Structures are given as structure tokens and as C-alpha cells.
């Protein structure tokens, strides 16, 4: 053909998106990785995904795992392989080592199974192939070199076949060499990695296309996460700068707020509320949210420092109840803690979340709290996630951070988000007369005008009233003022 | 010959700079690199230009890959070899191995090939030739001792034959030995490193050219794109300092900014605009990109912080409006997140775009959204980039900054471009009687006078305002100025 390679989807949710399509047609894509990265799981969801969504026959090739444990395992994921098998679709050609004995099983091996797989492909009428950890095969008793060979042997007997292949291999190190034998890499055309990388006391799994020769691909590791509905990727530096913005407002709870920012948030856009330990952030979402239930709209609330009866508790004592927003469906409560898991798994949460009850509204109190410990580059990245998402699909988000220090602050955040929010709402102590009192800046603000006053607020049981600026002093941001003024009232 | 060693173009985009011409005519360059750095690709695009811009004849060497294969793969880039090599110019020799079987056929190996090579030369008059993974051969089973004799004896043929070679390697450690069997590095004249190091889930190509006998040439990696186009090397280092530079003036779309840096910006000047979050960089930028067609002047406007969208929007509540701008074909809007790409690659888009649509003004919002993430040091390479080569064109360029600490920030850019930029404006927040007024100091102008006061400014549906200074406080620089009555 005088074209560029094409490519079959995978329908891997992600994949097609890194891989400009999928993958290139009668070609071998190598996918390698080491002990449970998703390996198997992802030749599956390969078959899988052809049979039901483009009715394209396959056969899954397995030397280590029984035909039996494949169909079984594949019941995690809510796929009946034993239908497809009977229906003529599937076709698990079993090339396993039976449990008794037998020497010499290296050269009509490869040959007698070529045929094998032929007669499969041939018989079933399959275009989509998946060969299951090579790698234990010539690991009967084999060198570097036998290895290349025998590989180039099976790509290319394959390739004449018209295939589109997904063979598999097992690795050592997480970042060490490809696969086993330091020879697939280049004896493939596509080079797939699969990665469990520890780092810390978390797993982070990535995948990254290492080659498409012929076409083009994203470059690098993406993360992902194994679901019950397979492995599922995210794109993140893939993700489009098109959101959609309107100049629809929404209201934050408190009017007075509302007022400060040119009358209340806009429908689109991502909000942030900073500032030191018990300044009021959680008071601010909690009335975010009820907002979005007194007017019949669906709001979630991701907390990740409190629970899901201190945050009732609490509420009911500022007068909103969150009991009713529950009942009447509207307002829906997650809490979890951020070390359960690592950035990756509470980004799909979250967008699970999301997707079952099609929020209007949403508020993650604490980003501050996810970036504990996570590397600044993990934490950023995943904020473009939440941000990204909510961005694109006409969520308001609203955020909490924490300030690492009260009084002094000298940066709105300290893993500098800053550019990536659309409104910043800034709360801080400030010290008067030996007393600490709260001070509400809406200290930007996109699309609106908004005000520039320090003004101070109080916290009772009605919520947050906001008061007036402290115009006689000096030094209000550093939290410790002066007074002012040096002429009262006197004669002529 | 009794003179400098003649180099032969490669036409590889930014690769003859780096060495200096070309690759040293007669001799074999051994290019080595691990899987997926674009060692295939180089030594077609080697063969494929010298038949293209100077009817260079070109063998090309197979070992592994298939010839339909070879062909095919290259339509990605445009590239018909199926017609080259029915025109005689180009002659792909197939030496893989038999899909199907034997062991005894190639028992005169190493010198059958070079008679089939060398018949091969003679035939299409071949004066590139490109042999590619050489490594897969003895991945038979074979010692480096043995490796390094082959190797030689092969090399040595073709040098005499006088054919100027290109031999690719295989690696594993992105930065180990050269080669396999750490015997190709010497047994080669000139020695190039691919590299995809990763780094942080980002990749990064860069090229290496080790060493040359006999000649100079470009130490150290440059880093390169492998694009619809083929390799595509910047060698950045090889910019010169040979920038145009006028004294015609051009605006800011702020008459009163214009006026505080006496008369304008400078048509050939790299202007900064650094300030807080939310102290109004874009709302200059807008200014600025608009100010260009008003005047019948492209523009293009990166953003990498919000979108065409929301842009969109908030343009239209300064005044303006951009909608026009992209229809009349005076603006172009871009957009993306720093995260979708590398540093190497966004200064290719960069470029990329300027030269279809040969913009007047550029605007990058948010430099310091790019520097997320990155290296310092690799970094300033990008800035050195982008604003060497608009610099180079002619091109008026409105970078943005946001300093990380809103209020007594202690230096104009945590990332330090200062002192790559002609032209800075300063935007910092002043606490005045509880509340946050704004404020706008032209700080500084390489080739004018400029206002030096710090003038305080309002931000209105009309636009910025930029009124007086503070002059009865003190410490205005600190945020939390000292009003003295
Ligand atoms: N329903 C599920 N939900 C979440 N994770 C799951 C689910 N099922 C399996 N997993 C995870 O995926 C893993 C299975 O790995 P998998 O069988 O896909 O291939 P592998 O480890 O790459 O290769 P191989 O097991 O053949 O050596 C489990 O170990 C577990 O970590
Ligand atoms: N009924 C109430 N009356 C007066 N003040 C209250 C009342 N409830 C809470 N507060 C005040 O509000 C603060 C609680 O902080 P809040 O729930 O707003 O979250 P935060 O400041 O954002 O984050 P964190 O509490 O984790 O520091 C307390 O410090 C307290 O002074
Ligand atoms: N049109 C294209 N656009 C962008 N990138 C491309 C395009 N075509 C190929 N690529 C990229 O270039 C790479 C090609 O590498 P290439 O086949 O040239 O040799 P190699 O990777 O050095 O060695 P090997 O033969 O072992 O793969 C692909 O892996 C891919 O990342
Ligand atoms: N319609 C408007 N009317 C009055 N003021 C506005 C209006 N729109 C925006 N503003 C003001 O302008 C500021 C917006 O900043 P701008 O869009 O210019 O970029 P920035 O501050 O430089 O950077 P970033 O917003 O990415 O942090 C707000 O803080 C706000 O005070
Ligand atoms: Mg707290
Ligand atoms: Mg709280
Ligand atoms: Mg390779
Ligand atoms: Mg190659
Ligand atoms: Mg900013
Ligand atoms: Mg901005």
C-alpha cells in the first residue's frame, strides 16, 4: 500500500489516544512489564474489546496460565470468555506444559505451533492476536542469540499471516532493561512498557509506547489503573486546552461573598480558598455546597481531612443540614484518607464519582492534603486532572489548601497552583488588640470585577458575616497590623 | 589527499552545524542508540536526501527489517523509496535472515555480503550507504574480539571501495557503554549517540556527535524531534549573537504604558511582564496581541495557562474582541498544556506556527507555566530559543512571568530570564488601607528612557488605567507600603 500505516483500535480506554489510533495493522506490538503491571490483562482487553465492539475473531495464545484460569480471572472485569468461546469468537489455543514430562519440546515447538496458531487464525477467521508471555517459552534453556532468532522467527511468520498481534513479556527490573533478554526491544516493531513503580510505600502504574515504527505516538509513561472494567489511562498531557466558558454566575452561599466577586462565581470556572489551619475553608464549601441544593442541583463533596459525621456534626452547628441534601438526593459526601491509595487511584475515583451522579457542583476540601508527601510534579499533575475535568464537563470546582504557616504567608500556595485557578479566595489571621481575627479577600477573580477589601468576618451559628476593611492599619497581610491616624478633633 | 577532510551534507536539519559540514566523505560514522531513538531513521533520511538534493546514488543495507517493511515505514515521513529504488538511485539490500529455516547458507559470511555490497555500489554507483543494525548480525553468537574483526575487516572494504558509511548500533543503558559489546566505538571513525533519556515520564531525544577523526565538530548532545519531516535537530548552542536590531518603536495597545517607556516597545525586543497571580499579565498581553491588528499586523498567542475559550471571554469584558481578530486573519490563537510535551518539542510548535503564519507580535503567556516541572538549566535553553529566534525575525515578543510569592517577591523571575530580556514590566499588588490596589513599573528599557515611577493602575471593563504613584509612602516594593503623613 502507498500509505502510512494503519492502526485497529484497542478501545482501551486511554491507549488509542497515546497511540494516534491504536495499533498498526499486521504488525506485533511487544507489551512488557514486570510481575503484575497488566500484562495479561491488557493482550485480553485487546481480544476483548475487538470481538464485542468490531466483531473481529481472535485467538489468545497462553503457554503459562490455563485456558480455565484465563476465562475464570477474566470474570474480574465482567467478561464471559466462555460465551465468546463457544460462539465461535474466541479461541483460547492452549500451549501450556502439561503436568507430567516430555524432553526435547524446542524445535518443532515454534514450528508445530506456527501452524497451530495458523490453523487457529485461519479457522476462526481471526484478525487479532494475543501470544501470553513468550518469554516462558525459551526459558527451557536458551542464550541472547537463540532468543533473537527464534523471536524474528514468530514476528515474521506472523506478520505473512496478516495479524495484528499482542505478544507479552516479563522484566526484572522496573527502569533496568526492557525485557528479559535485552533482544525483544528491537527484534519487535512496537515496543509497549508496563510499569508498577514503587517510590515511596505507593505503586504508581504507568505505561509508555517506547516505539510505533512507521507511525507517531505520545512520548513517555501515563499513568493508569486496573478497574472493573480493565486498564483505563489518562491522557493527562494529551487532555485539550478547549474548555468551554460562560459567563453564567452561580452563587457561593454567602452573599456578601457573592457581592465581593461581582456577583457570585462563574458557572465555569475552578475556585480556590487558602489559608492558614481554622480560618474557615471548610466553612466556605459547606455552605458551596448546600448552595447547590437549595436551588435543586446535584453537588459532591471529596473531604480528605475530616469524616463523614464530624463534617454532619459541624454543619448542622454552622445551621445548613447536610442530612436533607442526602435524603433529597442532591448533595452527595465521599471522605477518604490520602495515603489510602496514591494520586492516581483518587483522580478515577474521583472521576467515577462524578460520572454516576453528574454533579453541578464540586468541592474537594484539602488539596493541600493530596500533596502530602506526592512529588510536586505528581501533585500538579493531578490537579490539571480534577481542574481539567470539572473544566471541560461545566463543573464549578472549589478547592481548599491549607497554608503551611499562619500569618506570614508570603505565597497563596505553596506547590504553587496558583496559575491554574480561575478565582482565588484568600482567608487569613490577622492579630488585633491580642485577639486573632479573620480577614476574606477575594483576591482575584477572571472574568469578574470583585472587590479589593480586606474585609474581616466573624463565624457563628448563622455561618460567616462579613464585616468591613481595616483601612487604619498598615501591614494587614502580614497578619500582625499598626493602627493609624494622628489627629482626632480639636478647636479652630 | 593533502587537505582538510571533506564533509558530505547530510540535509538533516540542524545535523551539518553540529558537524561542522557533514559526515567525513569516505569514512563510516557508526551511530549508535537504544531501541526507538531513530537510528533507522537517520540513516534513511542519510540516503534518502543525498538522492534527493544531490542524486547521490544509495545503497541501503538491511538486517533486520523487511524491505516492504523499510519502504513502507517511511511513508510516514512522504518518502516514495519504492520509486527510488525503481529509478536506480536507491538499492535496499536485503540481508535478514529466511523466515522459514536453514543454518548452512551463510557459512562465507561477512565477506559474501561485502561482495554483494560492493557489487551493489558498482551497480547504482552508490556513494552513501547506510548499513543498519550491523549488531543483529554476530547476535548469532559471537565475543567482542570477535566483533571487532568483522566489524573492521567490513568497515575497511567499504573505505576502500571509497563509500561514505553510516553503520547503526544497538544499545541498552541510555548512558553506558556506546555499543553492545563496547568494540564498535573504536573500530569506527566517527561515533553519534541517540538518546531518548526519560527523566521524569517525559522523554527527551538528544544527539551526540562523540568524536570525528580528523576534524572539529560540536561537542556535547543537542536536543532533536523526530516529526512528520523527518530528524530535526536545534542546535542552540549554535545561535549566534547576530540579532537585527532596530530602534523603531511599536505599542503596547496602552497608550499611557507606551508613554512610560518612552514612546512604545521596541520593534526588535524581548519584553517581559512579570507580576503576582492576578496582577494582570494577560490582561497586557490581550492589549498587546490586539494592538497588532489594529494596525494590520499578525499576531499569534500561545496560551498554555487558560483557554480559546475563556480567553475569548475575558477579552471580550476588557473591550476588544477577539472573535474579529481570528476571522479577519490577524490573530491566531493557540492553546495547550505545558504537560502535553516536552520543552523540545513546544519550541518546535513555537516555530512551527511563526513560519506559516509569519506573525508581527508573539505573545507566550505564562513562561513560567513552561518552567513547571522542568530543569532550570534546560529551561533557560527553551527561553534562549524562543526568544533568540524571534529575535532573529524581526518578531516583537510579550513573554509572561508569575512570580511565585505575591507581595515582597525578591526578585523579577525565580527562574532568572532577566537578564535574556530587553524590556521588563513589573506588576505588583500594595496594600492600601485594607484593600489590594494594583501597580505598574516600567522597570526597565535596554534602548530608551522610561518613566521609573511605580504608578498605580485600575482594571476596568475598559481596560487597564494605568493613574499616579504612590510618592507620600515608603517601602511601596515591600507590598505593605508605610504611608508618612
Ligand atoms: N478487578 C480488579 N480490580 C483492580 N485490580 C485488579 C482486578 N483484577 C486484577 N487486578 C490487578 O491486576 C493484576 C493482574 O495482573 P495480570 O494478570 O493482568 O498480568 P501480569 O502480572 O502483567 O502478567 P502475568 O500475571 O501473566 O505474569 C492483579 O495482580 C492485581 O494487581
Ligand atoms: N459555631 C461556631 N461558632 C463560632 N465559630 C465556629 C463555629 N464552628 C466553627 N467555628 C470556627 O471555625 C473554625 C473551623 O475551621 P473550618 O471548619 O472553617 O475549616 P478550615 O479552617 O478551613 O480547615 P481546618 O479546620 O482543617 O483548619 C474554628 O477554628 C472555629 O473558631
Ligand atoms: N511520522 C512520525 N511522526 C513522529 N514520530 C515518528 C513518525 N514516525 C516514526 N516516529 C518515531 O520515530 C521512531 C522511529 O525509530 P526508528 O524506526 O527510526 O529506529 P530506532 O528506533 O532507532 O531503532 P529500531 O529499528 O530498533 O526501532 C518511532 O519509534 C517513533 O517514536
Ligand atoms: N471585567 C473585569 N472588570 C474589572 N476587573 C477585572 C475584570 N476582569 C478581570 N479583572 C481583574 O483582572 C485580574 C485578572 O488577571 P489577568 O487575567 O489579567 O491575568 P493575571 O493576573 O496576570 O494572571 P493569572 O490570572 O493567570 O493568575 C483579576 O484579578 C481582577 O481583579
Ligand atoms: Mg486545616
Ligand atoms: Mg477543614
Ligand atoms: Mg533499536
Ligand atoms: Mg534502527
Ligand atoms: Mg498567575
Ligand atoms: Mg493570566
Not at 131 to 160: C, G, M, N, P
Not at 172 to 198: C, H, K, M, T
Not at 345 to 360: C, G, R, T, V, Y
Request: charged content about 25%; hydrophobic content about 40%; aromatic content about 8%.
Amino acid at each position: 500500500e502507498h500509505q502510512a500505516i494503519a492502526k485497529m483500535r484497542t478501545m482501551i480506554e486511554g491507549f488509542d489516544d497515546i497511540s494516534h489510533g491504536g495499533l498498526p495493522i499486521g504488525r506485533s506490538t511487544l507489551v512488557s512489564g514486570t510481575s503484575g503491571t497488566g500484562k495479561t490483562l491488557f493482550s485480553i482487553q485487546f481480544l476483548y474489546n475487538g470481538i464485542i465492539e468490531f466483531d473481529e475473531p481472535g485467538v489468545f495464545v497462553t503457554f503459562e496460565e490455563t485456558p480455565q484460569d484465563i476465562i475464570k480471572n477474566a470474570r474480574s472485569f465482567g467478561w464471559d470468555l466462555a460465551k465468546l468461546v463457544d460462539e465461535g469468537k474466541l479461541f483460547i489455543l492452549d500451549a501450556s506444559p502439561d503436568p507430567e514430562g516430555q524432553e526435547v519440546v524446542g524445535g518443532f515447538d515454534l514450528s508445530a505451533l506456527i501452524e497451530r496458531i495458523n490453523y487457529a487464525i485461519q479457522k476462526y477467521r481471526a484478525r487479532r492476536v494475543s501470544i501470553d508471555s513468550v518469554t516462558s517459552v525459551f526459558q527451557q534453556y536458551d542464550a541472547s542469540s537463540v532468543v533473537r532468532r527464534e523471536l524474528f522467527r514468530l514476528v515474521a511468520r506472523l506478520k505473512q499471516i496478516g495479524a495484528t498481534t499482542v505478544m507479552t513479556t516479563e522484566r526484572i527490573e522496573e527502569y533496568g532493561p526492557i525485557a528479559r533478554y535485552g533482544v525483544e526491544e528491537f527484534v519487535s516493531d512496537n515496543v509497549v512498557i508496563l510499569r508498577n513503580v514503587l517510590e515511596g510505600e505507593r505503586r504508581r502504574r504507568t505505561l509508555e509506547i517506547l516505539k510505533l515504527r512507521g507511525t507517531s505516538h505520545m512520548k513517555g509513561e501515563y499513568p493508569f489503573t486496573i478497574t472493573d472494567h480493565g486498564i483505563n489511562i489518562f491522557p493527562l498531557g494529551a487532555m485539550r486546552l478547549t474548555q468551554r466558558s460562560s459567563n453564567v454566575r452561580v452563587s457561593s452561599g454567602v452573599v456578601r461573598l457573592d457581592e465581593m466577586c461581582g456577583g457570585g462565581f462563574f458557572k465555569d470556572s475552578i475556585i480556590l480558598a487558602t489559608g492558614a489551619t481554622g480560618t474557615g475553608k471548610t466553612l466556605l464549601v459547606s455552605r458551596f455546597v448546600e448552595n447547590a441544593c437549595a436551588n435543586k442541583e446535584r453537588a459532591i463533596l471529596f473531604a480528605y481531612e475530616e469524616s463523614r459525621a464530624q463534617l454532619l456534626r459541624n454543619a448542622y452547628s454552622w445551621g445548613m443540614d447536610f442530612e436533607e441534601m442526602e435524603r433529597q438526593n442532591l448533595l452527595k459526601i465521599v471522605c477518604a484518607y490520602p495515603e489510602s491509595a496514591g494520586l492516581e487511584d483518587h483522580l478515577q475515583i474521583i472521576k467515577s464519582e462524578i460520572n454516576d451522579f453528574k454533579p453541578a457542583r464540586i468541592a474537594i476540601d484539602s488539596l493541600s492534603a493530596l500533596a502530602r508527601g506526592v512529588s510536586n510534579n505528581a501533585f500538579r499533575q493531578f490537579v490539571i486532572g480534577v481542574t481539567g475535568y470539572a473544566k471541560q464537563e461545566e463543573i464549578t470546582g472549589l478547592f481548599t489548601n491549607t497554608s503551611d504557616q499562619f500569618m506570614g504567608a508570603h505565597s497563596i500556595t505553596d506547590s504553587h497552583i496558583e496559575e491554574i485557578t480561575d478565582t482565588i479566595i484568600l482567608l487569613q489571621y490577622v492579630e488585633i488588640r491580642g485577639e486573632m481575627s479573620r480577614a476574606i479577600n477575594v483576591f482575584k477573580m477572571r472574568g469578574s470585577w470583585h472587590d479589593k477589601a480586606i474585609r474581616e468576618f466573624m463565624i457563628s451559628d448563622k455561618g460567616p458575616d462579613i464585616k468591613d476593611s481595616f483601612r487604619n492599619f498598615e501591614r494587614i497581610i502580614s497578619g500582625s497590623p499598626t493602627r493609624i491616624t494622628v489627629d482626632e478633633k480639636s478647636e479652630l
